[PDB]
Amino acid sequence: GSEDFQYAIDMFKKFIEEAAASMGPEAVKYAKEFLKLLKEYHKNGINNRLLKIALLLLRNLKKIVDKASQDLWRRHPDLIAPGGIAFSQRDRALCLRDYGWFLILIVMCLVSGDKGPIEKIGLKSIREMYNSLGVVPAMMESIRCLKEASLSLLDEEDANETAPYFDYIIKAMSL
């Protein structure tokens, strides 16, 4: 149980260290602030049922990003054709990396289970990281692909439990 939460924490801390340079100092600030809240929620038994889903998603991060990007590239093959923004090795690697980072941040939102801190803290981290990254090809479409890839690994009730978290970030980022 508590090592399941520590595995979540270890995933989020590894991401923050790895992305610190590329994401905002403000983005790091809000991500660390979110992480502190997740620990407080855990210590007080708050919204505990979301962790089991998040753990499945965290254990399958690369599978999800690969599935979501192959989906993305079949829907928009121009992205990887010659002349495409994701045709080059450097930029395609940057796309897959950035998509994985947005997925990790979305999974942090899921662990909180709470639309308050998601808007006040989680979404600020996502927005600051997007600002620091700059051009992220097919940003909005990639998030819908990450959602459908993530839900494809879930049973029925977990899927309908999880979809509204992807849905809130999708609409919030659409502005």
Side-chain angles (χ1 to χ4, degrees), residues 2 12 18-19 26 35 40 51-52 55 66 75 98 101 106 110 114 117 121 126 128 131-132 139 145 159 163 166:
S2 202
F12 300 142
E18 286 177 348
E26 286 309 293
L35 192 46
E40 294 306 304
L51 182 64
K52 174 192 173 301
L55 284 176
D66 292 348
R75 312 223 293 250
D98 296 351
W101 287 354
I106 292 170
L110 176 68
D114 185 346
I121 304 172
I126 290 165
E128 294 291 343
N131 189 68
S132 294
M139 163 78 169
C145 290
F166 283 96

PDB file of all heavy atoms in Angstrom, residues 2 12 18-19 26 35 40 51-52 55 66 75 98 101 106 110 114 117 121 126 128 131-132 139 145 159 163 166:
ATOM      1  N   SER A   2       1.589   1.487   1.066  1.00  0.00           N
ATOM      2  CA  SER A   2       2.342   2.735   1.186  1.00  0.00           C
ATOM      3  C   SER A   2       3.580   2.730   0.294  1.00  0.00           C
ATOM      4  O   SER A   2       4.093   3.797  -0.063  1.00  0.00           O
ATOM      5  CB  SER A   2       2.718   2.986   2.651  1.00  0.00           C
ATOM      6  OG  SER A   2       2.986   4.354   2.879  1.00  0.00           O
ATOM      7  N   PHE A  12       7.033  10.589  -9.805  1.00  0.00           N
ATOM      8  CA  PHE A  12       6.850  12.026  -9.966  1.00  0.00           C
ATOM      9  C   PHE A  12       8.140  12.787  -9.687  1.00  0.00           C
ATOM     10  O   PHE A  12       8.460  13.745 -10.395  1.00  0.00           O
ATOM     11  CB  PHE A  12       5.736  12.520  -9.054  1.00  0.00           C
ATOM     12  CG  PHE A  12       4.394  11.881  -9.328  1.00  0.00           C
ATOM     13  CD1 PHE A  12       3.547  11.568  -8.282  1.00  0.00           C
ATOM     14  CD2 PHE A  12       3.995  11.588 -10.631  1.00  0.00           C
ATOM     15  CE1 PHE A  12       2.305  10.981  -8.513  1.00  0.00           C
ATOM     16  CE2 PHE A  12       2.751  10.997 -10.885  1.00  0.00           C
ATOM     17  CZ  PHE A  12       1.912  10.697  -9.824  1.00  0.00           C
ATOM     18  N   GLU A  18      14.043  15.181 -13.991  1.00  0.00           N
ATOM     19  CA  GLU A  18      14.434  15.050 -15.391  1.00  0.00           C
ATOM     20  C   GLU A  18      13.953  16.238 -16.209  1.00  0.00           C
ATOM     21  O   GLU A  18      14.676  16.732 -17.077  1.00  0.00           O
ATOM     22  CB  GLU A  18      13.913  13.737 -15.961  1.00  0.00           C
ATOM     23  CG  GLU A  18      14.706  12.539 -15.454  1.00  0.00           C
ATOM     24  CD  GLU A  18      14.156  11.217 -15.944  1.00  0.00           C
ATOM     25  OE1 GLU A  18      13.025  11.207 -16.484  1.00  0.00           O
ATOM     26  OE2 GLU A  18      14.861  10.193 -15.784  1.00  0.00           O
ATOM     27  N   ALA A  19      12.764  16.747 -15.915  1.00  0.00           N
ATOM     28  CA  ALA A  19      12.205  17.820 -16.721  1.00  0.00           C
ATOM     29  C   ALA A  19      12.552  19.207 -16.210  1.00  0.00           C
ATOM     30  O   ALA A  19      12.301  20.178 -16.931  1.00  0.00           O
ATOM     31  CB  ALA A  19      10.684  17.677 -16.813  1.00  0.00           C
ATOM     32  N   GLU A  26       8.887  27.962 -12.790  1.00  0.00           N
ATOM     33  CA  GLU A  26       7.523  28.064 -12.281  1.00  0.00           C
ATOM     34  C   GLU A  26       6.806  26.724 -12.399  1.00  0.00           C
ATOM     35  O   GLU A  26       6.084  26.309 -11.483  1.00  0.00           O
ATOM     36  CB  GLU A  26       6.762  29.152 -13.045  1.00  0.00           C
ATOM     37  CG  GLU A  26       7.132  30.612 -12.713  1.00  0.00           C
ATOM     38  CD  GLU A  26       7.125  30.937 -11.220  1.00  0.00           C
ATOM     39  OE1 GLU A  26       6.034  30.925 -10.614  1.00  0.00           O
ATOM     40  OE2 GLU A  26       8.205  31.245 -10.665  1.00  0.00           O
ATOM     41  N   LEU A  35       3.023  17.900  -5.645  1.00  0.00           N
ATOM     42  CA  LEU A  35       3.547  16.698  -5.006  1.00  0.00           C
ATOM     43  C   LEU A  35       3.380  16.768  -3.492  1.00  0.00           C
ATOM     44  O   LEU A  35       3.066  15.764  -2.840  1.00  0.00           O
ATOM     45  CB  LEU A  35       5.021  16.525  -5.387  1.00  0.00           C
ATOM     46  CG  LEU A  35       5.715  15.209  -5.071  1.00  0.00           C
ATOM     47  CD1 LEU A  35       4.836  14.041  -5.473  1.00  0.00           C
ATOM     48  CD2 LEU A  35       7.056  15.130  -5.773  1.00  0.00           C
ATOM     49  N   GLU A  40       0.140  15.024   1.424  1.00  0.00           N
ATOM     50  CA  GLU A  40      -0.776  15.377   2.505  1.00  0.00           C
ATOM     51  C   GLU A  40      -2.101  14.643   2.351  1.00  0.00           C
ATOM     52  O   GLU A  40      -2.610  14.063   3.315  1.00  0.00           O
ATOM     53  CB  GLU A  40      -0.985  16.891   2.560  1.00  0.00           C
ATOM     54  CG  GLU A  40       0.284  17.640   2.933  1.00  0.00           C
ATOM     55  CD  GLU A  40       0.904  17.127   4.227  1.00  0.00           C
ATOM     56  OE1 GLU A  40       0.198  17.105   5.258  1.00  0.00           O
ATOM     57  OE2 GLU A  40       2.088  16.723   4.207  1.00  0.00           O
ATOM     58  N   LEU A  51      -5.535   6.091  -6.597  1.00  0.00           N
ATOM     59  CA  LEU A  51      -4.130   5.692  -6.709  1.00  0.00           C
ATOM     60  C   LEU A  51      -3.972   4.401  -7.506  1.00  0.00           C
ATOM     61  O   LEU A  51      -3.006   4.242  -8.257  1.00  0.00           O
ATOM     62  CB  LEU A  51      -3.503   5.524  -5.322  1.00  0.00           C
ATOM     63  CG  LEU A  51      -2.003   5.161  -5.310  1.00  0.00           C
ATOM     64  CD1 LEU A  51      -1.129   6.270  -5.902  1.00  0.00           C
ATOM     65  CD2 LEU A  51      -1.515   4.785  -3.917  1.00  0.00           C
ATOM     66  N   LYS A  52      -4.904   3.463  -7.341  1.00  0.00           N
ATOM     67  CA  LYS A  52      -4.803   2.174  -8.023  1.00  0.00           C
ATOM     68  C   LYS A  52      -4.804   2.348  -9.535  1.00  0.00           C
ATOM     69  O   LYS A  52      -4.067   1.655 -10.246  1.00  0.00           O
ATOM     70  CB  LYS A  52      -5.955   1.260  -7.605  1.00  0.00           C
ATOM     71  CG  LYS A  52      -6.010  -0.055  -8.383  1.00  0.00           C
ATOM     72  CD  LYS A  52      -7.318  -0.793  -8.159  1.00  0.00           C
ATOM     73  CE  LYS A  52      -7.398  -1.997  -9.078  1.00  0.00           C
ATOM     74  NZ  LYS A  52      -7.295  -1.581 -10.509  1.00  0.00           N
ATOM     75  N   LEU A  55      -1.458   4.074 -10.695  1.00  0.00           N
ATOM     76  CA  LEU A  55      -0.337   3.143 -10.680  1.00  0.00           C
ATOM     77  C   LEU A  55      -0.301   2.305 -11.951  1.00  0.00           C
ATOM     78  O   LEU A  55       0.774   2.075 -12.518  1.00  0.00           O
ATOM     79  CB  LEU A  55      -0.424   2.243  -9.449  1.00  0.00           C
ATOM     80  CG  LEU A  55      -0.032   2.882  -8.118  1.00  0.00           C
ATOM     81  CD1 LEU A  55      -0.265   1.886  -7.007  1.00  0.00           C
ATOM     82  CD2 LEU A  55       1.421   3.292  -8.149  1.00  0.00           C
ATOM     83  N   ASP A  66       3.728   5.351 -26.638  1.00  0.00           N
ATOM     84  CA  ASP A  66       3.900   4.717 -27.942  1.00  0.00           C
ATOM     85  C   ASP A  66       2.554   4.506 -28.630  1.00  0.00           C
ATOM     86  O   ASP A  66       2.386   4.838 -29.812  1.00  0.00           O
ATOM     87  CB  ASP A  66       4.645   3.387 -27.791  1.00  0.00           C
ATOM     88  CG  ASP A  66       6.091   3.577 -27.362  1.00  0.00           C
ATOM     89  OD1 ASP A  66       6.582   4.730 -27.395  1.00  0.00           O
ATOM     90  OD2 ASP A  66       6.740   2.572 -27.002  1.00  0.00           O
ATOM     91  N   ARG A  75      -3.603   9.291 -37.647  1.00  0.00           N
ATOM     92  CA  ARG A  75      -4.613  10.320 -37.881  1.00  0.00           C
ATOM     93  C   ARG A  75      -4.048  11.529 -38.614  1.00  0.00           C
ATOM     94  O   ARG A  75      -4.783  12.204 -39.344  1.00  0.00           O
ATOM     95  CB  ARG A  75      -5.235  10.762 -36.554  1.00  0.00           C
ATOM     96  CG  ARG A  75      -5.658   9.607 -35.662  1.00  0.00           C
ATOM     97  CD  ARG A  75      -7.015   9.840 -35.031  1.00  0.00           C
ATOM     98  NE  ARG A  75      -7.000  10.934 -34.065  1.00  0.00           N
ATOM     99  CZ  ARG A  75      -7.119  10.770 -32.751  1.00  0.00           C
ATOM    100  NH1 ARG A  75      -7.262   9.550 -32.244  1.00  0.00           N
ATOM    101  NH2 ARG A  75      -7.100  11.824 -31.943  1.00  0.00           N
ATOM    102  N   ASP A  98       7.901  15.033 -24.707  1.00  0.00           N
ATOM    103  CA  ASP A  98       6.978  16.023 -24.168  1.00  0.00           C
ATOM    104  C   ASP A  98       5.623  15.392 -23.880  1.00  0.00           C
ATOM    105  O   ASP A  98       4.994  15.696 -22.860  1.00  0.00           O
ATOM    106  CB  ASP A  98       6.830  17.195 -25.138  1.00  0.00           C
ATOM    107  CG  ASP A  98       8.120  17.972 -25.343  1.00  0.00           C
ATOM    108  OD1 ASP A  98       9.113  17.737 -24.616  1.00  0.00           O
ATOM    109  OD2 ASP A  98       8.131  18.848 -26.236  1.00  0.00           O
ATOM    110  N   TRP A 101       5.734  13.645 -20.641  1.00  0.00           N
ATOM    111  CA  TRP A 101       5.704  14.588 -19.523  1.00  0.00           C
ATOM    112  C   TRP A 101       4.293  15.113 -19.274  1.00  0.00           C
ATOM    113  O   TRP A 101       3.847  15.191 -18.116  1.00  0.00           O
ATOM    114  CB  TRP A 101       6.658  15.750 -19.793  1.00  0.00           C
ATOM    115  CG  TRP A 101       8.095  15.369 -19.665  1.00  0.00           C
ATOM    116  CD1 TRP A 101       8.594  14.172 -19.232  1.00  0.00           C
ATOM    117  CD2 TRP A 101       9.226  16.179 -20.001  1.00  0.00           C
ATOM    118  NE1 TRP A 101       9.969  14.193 -19.265  1.00  0.00           N
ATOM    119  CE2 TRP A 101      10.384  15.411 -19.743  1.00  0.00           C
ATOM    120  CE3 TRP A 101       9.376  17.477 -20.499  1.00  0.00           C
ATOM    121  CZ2 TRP A 101      11.671  15.904 -19.956  1.00  0.00           C
ATOM    122  CZ3 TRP A 101      10.669  17.966 -20.714  1.00  0.00           C
ATOM    123  CH2 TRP A 101      11.793  17.179 -20.444  1.00  0.00           C
ATOM    124  N   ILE A 106      -0.715  14.771 -15.987  1.00  0.00           N
ATOM    125  CA  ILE A 106      -2.128  14.395 -15.918  1.00  0.00           C
ATOM    126  C   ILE A 106      -2.339  13.301 -14.878  1.00  0.00           C
ATOM    127  O   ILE A 106      -3.337  13.307 -14.142  1.00  0.00           O
ATOM    128  CB  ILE A 106      -2.627  13.980 -17.314  1.00  0.00           C
ATOM    129  CG1 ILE A 106      -2.658  15.206 -18.224  1.00  0.00           C
ATOM    130  CG2 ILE A 106      -3.993  13.296 -17.232  1.00  0.00           C
ATOM    131  CD1 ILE A 106      -2.907  14.884 -19.673  1.00  0.00           C
ATOM    132  N   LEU A 110      -4.723  13.034 -11.544  1.00  0.00           N
ATOM    133  CA  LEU A 110      -5.592  11.912 -11.198  1.00  0.00           C
ATOM    134  C   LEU A 110      -5.384  11.472  -9.752  1.00  0.00           C
ATOM    135  O   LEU A 110      -6.356  11.194  -9.034  1.00  0.00           O
ATOM    136  CB  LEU A 110      -5.351  10.752 -12.164  1.00  0.00           C
ATOM    137  CG  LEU A 110      -6.098   9.437 -11.919  1.00  0.00           C
ATOM    138  CD1 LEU A 110      -7.600   9.577 -12.153  1.00  0.00           C
ATOM    139  CD2 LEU A 110      -5.511   8.339 -12.789  1.00  0.00           C
ATOM    140  N   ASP A 114      -9.099  15.549  -7.143  1.00  0.00           N
ATOM    141  CA  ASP A 114      -9.763  16.737  -6.603  1.00  0.00           C
ATOM    142  C   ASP A 114      -9.646  17.863  -7.615  1.00  0.00           C
ATOM    143  O   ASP A 114      -8.550  18.383  -7.841  1.00  0.00           O
ATOM    144  CB  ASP A 114      -9.153  17.135  -5.255  1.00  0.00           C
ATOM    145  CG  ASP A 114      -9.879  18.291  -4.586  1.00  0.00           C
ATOM    146  OD1 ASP A 114     -10.688  18.985  -5.245  1.00  0.00           O
ATOM    147  OD2 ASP A 114      -9.637  18.510  -3.379  1.00  0.00           O
ATOM    148  N   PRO A 117      -7.479  21.502  -6.580  1.00  0.00           N
ATOM    149  CA  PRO A 117      -6.023  21.585  -6.800  1.00  0.00           C
ATOM    150  C   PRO A 117      -5.608  21.289  -8.230  1.00  0.00           C
ATOM    151  O   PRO A 117      -4.554  21.770  -8.674  1.00  0.00           O
ATOM    152  CB  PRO A 117      -5.462  20.534  -5.829  1.00  0.00           C
ATOM    153  CG  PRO A 117      -6.524  20.337  -4.810  1.00  0.00           C
ATOM    154  CD  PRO A 117      -7.828  20.583  -5.486  1.00  0.00           C
ATOM    155  N   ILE A 121      -3.407  24.201  -9.225  1.00  0.00           N
ATOM    156  CA  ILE A 121      -1.998  23.827  -9.115  1.00  0.00           C
ATOM    157  C   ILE A 121      -1.578  22.955 -10.290  1.00  0.00           C
ATOM    158  O   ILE A 121      -0.609  23.269 -10.993  1.00  0.00           O
ATOM    159  CB  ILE A 121      -1.705  23.111  -7.782  1.00  0.00           C
ATOM    160  CG1 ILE A 121      -2.140  23.981  -6.600  1.00  0.00           C
ATOM    161  CG2 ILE A 121      -0.201  22.771  -7.687  1.00  0.00           C
ATOM    162  CD1 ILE A 121      -2.058  23.282  -5.256  1.00  0.00           C
ATOM    163  N   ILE A 126       1.024  22.345 -15.881  1.00  0.00           N
ATOM    164  CA  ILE A 126       0.906  21.980 -17.290  1.00  0.00           C
ATOM    165  C   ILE A 126       1.097  23.203 -18.182  1.00  0.00           C
ATOM    166  O   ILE A 126       1.821  23.155 -19.188  1.00  0.00           O
ATOM    167  CB  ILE A 126      -0.449  21.302 -17.544  1.00  0.00           C
ATOM    168  CG1 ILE A 126      -0.478  19.924 -16.883  1.00  0.00           C
ATOM    169  CG2 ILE A 126      -0.723  21.215 -19.042  1.00  0.00           C
ATOM    170  CD1 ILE A 126      -1.897  19.332 -16.782  1.00  0.00           C
ATOM    171  N   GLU A 128       2.558  26.181 -17.487  1.00  0.00           N
ATOM    172  CA  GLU A 128       3.919  26.710 -17.426  1.00  0.00           C
ATOM    173  C   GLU A 128       4.885  25.819 -18.205  1.00  0.00           C
ATOM    174  O   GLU A 128       5.762  26.321 -18.917  1.00  0.00           O
ATOM    175  CB  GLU A 128       4.374  26.857 -15.971  1.00  0.00           C
ATOM    176  CG  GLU A 128       3.609  27.908 -15.122  1.00  0.00           C
ATOM    177  CD  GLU A 128       3.867  29.356 -15.526  1.00  0.00           C
ATOM    178  OE1 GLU A 128       4.859  29.616 -16.236  1.00  0.00           O
ATOM    179  OE2 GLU A 128       3.083  30.237 -15.110  1.00  0.00           O
ATOM    180  N   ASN A 131       4.410  26.501 -21.828  1.00  0.00           N
ATOM    181  CA  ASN A 131       5.080  27.750 -22.165  1.00  0.00           C
ATOM    182  C   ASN A 131       6.596  27.585 -22.255  1.00  0.00           C
ATOM    183  O   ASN A 131       7.248  28.229 -23.088  1.00  0.00           O
ATOM    184  CB  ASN A 131       4.751  28.829 -21.145  1.00  0.00           C
ATOM    185  CG  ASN A 131       5.247  30.186 -21.576  1.00  0.00           C
ATOM    186  OD1 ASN A 131       4.741  30.760 -22.540  1.00  0.00           O
ATOM    187  ND2 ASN A 131       6.274  30.690 -20.893  1.00  0.00           N
ATOM    188  N   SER A 132       7.184  26.781 -21.372  1.00  0.00           N
ATOM    189  CA  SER A 132       8.632  26.613 -21.405  1.00  0.00           C
ATOM    190  C   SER A 132       9.068  25.760 -22.588  1.00  0.00           C
ATOM    191  O   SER A 132      10.126  26.016 -23.178  1.00  0.00           O
ATOM    192  CB  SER A 132       9.124  26.006 -20.101  1.00  0.00           C
ATOM    193  OG  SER A 132       8.904  26.929 -19.053  1.00  0.00           O
ATOM    194  N   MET A 139      -0.331  19.524 -30.076  1.00  0.00           N
ATOM    195  CA  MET A 139      -0.454  19.469 -28.622  1.00  0.00           C
ATOM    196  C   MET A 139      -1.817  18.923 -28.186  1.00  0.00           C
ATOM    197  O   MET A 139      -1.900  17.967 -27.401  1.00  0.00           O
ATOM    198  CB  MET A 139      -0.224  20.871 -28.059  1.00  0.00           C
ATOM    199  CG  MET A 139      -0.698  21.053 -26.660  1.00  0.00           C
ATOM    200  SD  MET A 139       0.488  20.320 -25.543  1.00  0.00           S
ATOM    201  CE  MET A 139      -0.149  20.958 -23.998  1.00  0.00           C
ATOM    202  N   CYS A 145      -5.136  11.546 -27.727  1.00  0.00           N
ATOM    203  CA  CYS A 145      -4.562  10.228 -27.982  1.00  0.00           C
ATOM    204  C   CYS A 145      -4.048   9.590 -26.698  1.00  0.00           C
ATOM    205  O   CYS A 145      -4.183   8.377 -26.510  1.00  0.00           O
ATOM    206  CB  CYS A 145      -3.435  10.332 -29.013  1.00  0.00           C
ATOM    207  SG  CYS A 145      -4.031  10.714 -30.672  1.00  0.00           S
ATOM    208  N   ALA A 159     -12.276   3.173 -16.472  1.00  0.00           N
ATOM    209  CA  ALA A 159     -12.229   4.039 -17.647  1.00  0.00           C
ATOM    210  C   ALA A 159     -13.140   5.244 -17.470  1.00  0.00           C
ATOM    211  O   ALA A 159     -12.724   6.390 -17.671  1.00  0.00           O
ATOM    212  CB  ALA A 159     -12.626   3.248 -18.896  1.00  0.00           C
ATOM    213  N   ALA A 163     -11.597   9.034 -17.431  1.00  0.00           N
ATOM    214  CA  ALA A 163     -11.883   9.937 -18.542  1.00  0.00           C
ATOM    215  C   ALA A 163     -12.146  11.385 -18.128  1.00  0.00           C
ATOM    216  O   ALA A 163     -11.570  12.288 -18.747  1.00  0.00           O
ATOM    217  CB  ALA A 163     -13.050   9.362 -19.355  1.00  0.00           C
ATOM    218  N   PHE A 166      -8.803  13.436 -17.850  1.00  0.00           N
ATOM    219  CA  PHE A 166      -8.321  13.834 -19.164  1.00  0.00           C
ATOM    220  C   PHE A 166      -9.228  14.902 -19.753  1.00  0.00           C
ATOM    221  O   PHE A 166      -8.751  15.865 -20.358  1.00  0.00           O
ATOM    222  CB  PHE A 166      -8.236  12.620 -20.093  1.00  0.00           C
ATOM    223  CG  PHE A 166      -7.035  11.739 -19.845  1.00  0.00           C
ATOM    224  CD1 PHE A 166      -7.138  10.617 -19.040  1.00  0.00           C
ATOM    225  CD2 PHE A 166      -5.809  12.026 -20.427  1.00  0.00           C
ATOM    226  CE1 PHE A 166      -6.037   9.799 -18.811  1.00  0.00           C
ATOM    227  CE2 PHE A 166      -4.705  11.214 -20.199  1.00  0.00           C
ATOM    228  CZ  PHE A 166      -4.821  10.098 -19.390  1.00  0.00           C
TER     229      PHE A 166
END
